[PDB]
From a paper:
Voltage-gated sodium (NaV) channels are responsible for the initiation and propagation of electrical signals in nerves, muscles, cardiomyocytes, and other excitable cells. Inactivation of the NaV channel terminates sodium influx and thus determines the availability of the channel. Prolonged depolarization or repetitive depolarizing pulses over a duration of tens of seconds cause slow inactivation of NaV channel, a phenomenon that is significantly different from the fast inactivation in the context of onset and recovery rate.
The NaVEh-expressing cells consistently generated robust inward currents regardless of with Ca2+ or EGTA. In the presence of the N-helix, the channel activates in response to depolarizing pulses, then the N-helix quickly blocks the open activation gate, resulting in the fast inactivation of NaVEh.
Author numbering:
A (entry chain E): 2 to 21
B (entry chain C), C (entry chain D), D (entry chain A), E (entry chain B): 69 to 358
The structure:
């Protein structure tokens, strides 16, 4: 899950960095 | 619209009434659990206890359902159709059970699985509490995202099942299969006695399983047996010591066949496909979260 | 406030004193580990060694605890209540152990589990080091996020446990169950001899388990046995070769029952629910990280 | 360019024709599954049924392929080369099968694996539906990201395989290995009788496996057997009760060897490397998603 | 600085020379793999083949190492100290092996594990290729992030190991343990015959394991055996059918003890701690990626 959960995280901060 | 319909309609939507109904559902679930724990036997010890407990629970659910429908004029098409029809079905099974307990067996013994629906009454609780409703709704709205990767998985699973039925459905058919030792080269026994007859490079080892079948007949006997065995391997349960290794070491020098079969199956399906499906499922759920 | 209270209060909060206490806790943990490694037997070889080691460790913890409380005027309500009361409980079990070692058995033999608390003294170290404290605090603040998905899991687990008790609690009850071969259609034996009596399509295989019980009585004998077996399947341990396959191949032509049972259980609970719970747990922890 | 080439070219690209071809592929897949389910035996019961079903399916695929190529002037170099050549190869195996069914066995019995390609015809469906095409294309474009971590994994796997072959290829070679009890210290038997000969602090337990081999000869007999066993441990299947524990308890007091071997192998390879590979795979796929 | 030092220094840093050295390392790795595959036996068939192959490989590595150091004036303190010293150690083992092959056994037979270092020569390749270097460097820089959660895991593992040694080290000590049936309530046998002596509610089950030990003595006999067994449970291997269930069903009515033990252990350690450790590891690696 940590492999799955972290992959989805990579998209959160990638999205977070996009708006910021 | 009935004259006293609006008052009872807003009465049922009261938070206190909703929590009382939730407590009733949880109490019924605990009653079923206690029945299956302290008295699940065919010769039940406290028989009327569970019989009349179910009687009272179905009666109370009937009264509360009638309260629910009387506020919507018995219509249940316009307001919360799915939950209302689910409630209808469970209360109907409840009335059927009470009618059987009162006036004999009006049903054939071939519909016990329909009586079994009482265990699924706890799903009514999910409408009572908002967080559990959110989680189940997110699961329902994320399943369609899963669908495509899931069908890819099942396609590949059926491909490997066809291959497995064609290859190993005949394996260990006598009930015993022969694996070949390498004792001479390893120096355990001299090369003279193996030809001379004191020792042998081959041993016959039984192929019968714990279920009484041979290896091929059970694991890959038919297409559906093969698909079930591949599901077992996909979950990762005993794929080597029971499913793979006898077939791997059946091949004297052609061992690359079974090893490549199971290794490629495990890698592709289990690792790649399971992780992809879980990733897309969780991605859809968290995209629905915000 | 005591006259010499502030000086000792700031003395205990010294980094050197905190690290010395941390070293003491780690040394006690290593002492317990060494006791359980080199001499865990009922007939202990070096008996007084561990007895007096525990004596000295509890004495030192008592002296350091008294130093801790003397700086807070023995109050421990206003400053770090939870850690202080935990410390208090462990010293209390330590003083109880020393009192028993000094003046006989003042306790009934029914409270050994309370004496067992010495193994949990290492949890005091987590307050000494900031990083371990951060991790455990994040775990504690992420558990409530888990709670809802966890209760959904246990609800579904109990549903499947009720179903399993109702279905398979009677399985393999004689101790042996019959699986049906398909030998004639596979050509292993001619159809003439099967009717004639040389071969049969139905071998009988024992259901008894490694624990001596039959399959139904152990795995799904009662509701709690069923819930434990479903937890075993949820973790993924031996769900097929022990739990599923005997029930799957018990059904002669109704095999869809057990296969759908275990397949749906595994998919929903294990894959979906385990990954959802872990995802929400880790999400809460990393949201607490920053 | 042929005179009536453009019309048939745009006719084949029609959505209705594409869905009809997709239905044909799915129907062929279901036909293969039904063949392997209801009649996979060597003595097939409905023999001509599957024979002529495959005949008709290959004939229809031939006619539709000729329709596909006639719109591209039989060129298939410029437009969708890979899918066209895959289609070509499957029809070619289909025409080969029909030719064998019509005019005897024109092939040696050593190319059944080439006839086996009919199971992979369902891969043609992935071009028919856009979502499955997206998923498989993302998998293909994410594999190269996996490649580096995968080769690191296999390098470490081969290192551990060399070590395992060198250490344990000789283990349990007699067929039985000796583990040493500690009964006298546990109080199970007095120290007098162990020297006196009533009891022994050693027991001899068989090393033979379910496949008939000894432990060393099967698990780590050769480098490829060792690599397969390490793959089994990497997936996590029965690494202790079959692979690790006999070697761990073979070492009387040198147990640190096998424990460190398998513990370090599991930690590094399984945890670290499996999670890294899956993380990079999924990262590449979702980076391709958007 | 040597007169002809700069020329050879830039000569060794040439891409072609680096790729030739990488090919040499990969060829040596393949040579070791082939040795362990086609001739790992104690009575080696092609003995001088591997002996002189290792001779030539160590000689070539010596010549290339001398080329490497001659460009840095044999200093190796200022430029790439870690890789240079690793190279030094492997070439030293190589010279030691060649010296033993030339002039007899100059070493005691107690340092074969040092000769074993030839299998780790492939780690030199990781410096040759940039991508593998990136991955291993990221792993090395992410391990310290793991350290804290890893030590929390091992602390909890040792806690559960102490508890397990204290509880179950005495379990199945006679070699057989008694589980209690519930036949009379289930109706399998009448209550009259159980008292009368035809049937019994208590079967006796052997506690001996595949390794010859009893259940307690092997799984939780000592603290380190307990820690290994808990690592086995943490990975998820056979924790129920071998480790948990005999202890669970040993408790006649106190079954809550073992079930809570193993359930809490699995949940906390496996699910929570394994997923947390993997999450922080992968997070650190991908934070190092960009």
């Amino acid at each position: 899950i940590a492999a799955i959960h972290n992959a989805r995280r990579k998209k959160r901060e990638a999205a977070a960095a996009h708006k910021a | 619209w009935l004259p006293h319909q609006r008052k009872v309609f807003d009465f049922y939507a009261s938070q206190g009434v909703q929590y009382f109904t939730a407590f009733l559902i949880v109490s019924n679930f605990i009653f079923n659990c206690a029945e299956k724990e302290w008295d699940p036997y065919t010769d039940q010890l406290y028989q009327g206890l569970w019989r009349w407990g179910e009687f009272a629970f179905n009666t109370m659910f009937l009264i509360e359902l009638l309260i629910n429908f009387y506020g919507i004029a018995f219509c249940f098409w316009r307001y919360n159709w799915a939950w209302n029809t689910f409630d209808l079905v469970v209360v109907a099974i409840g009335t059927l059970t009470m009618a059987e307990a009162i006036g004999g067996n009006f049903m054939p013994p071939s519909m016990a699985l329909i009586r079994n629906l009482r265990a699924f009454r706890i799903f009514r609780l999910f409408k009572r509490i908002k967080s559990l409703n959110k989680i189940i709704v997110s699961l329902g709205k994320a399943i369609p995202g899963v669908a495509n990767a899931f069908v890819i998985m099942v396609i590949i699973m059926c491909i490997y099942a066809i291959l497995g039925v064609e290859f190993y459905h005949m394996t260990g058919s006598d009930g015993t299969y022969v694996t070949y030792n390498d004792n001479v080269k390893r120096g355990l026994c001299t090369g003279d006695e193996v030809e001379l007859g004191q020792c042998s490079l081959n041993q016959t080892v039984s192929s019968e399983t714990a279920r009484g079948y041979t290896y091929g007949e059970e694991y890959y006997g038919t297409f559906f047996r093969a698909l079930y065995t591949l599901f077992q391997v996909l979950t990762g349960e005993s794929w080597s010591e029971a499913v793979a290794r006898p077939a791997v070491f059946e091949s004297h020098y052609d061992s690359f066949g079974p090893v490549l079969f199971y290794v490629s199956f495990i890698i592709i399906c289990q690792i790649v496909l399971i992780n992809v499906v879980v990733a897309v499922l969780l991605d859809k759920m968290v995209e629905e979260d915000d």
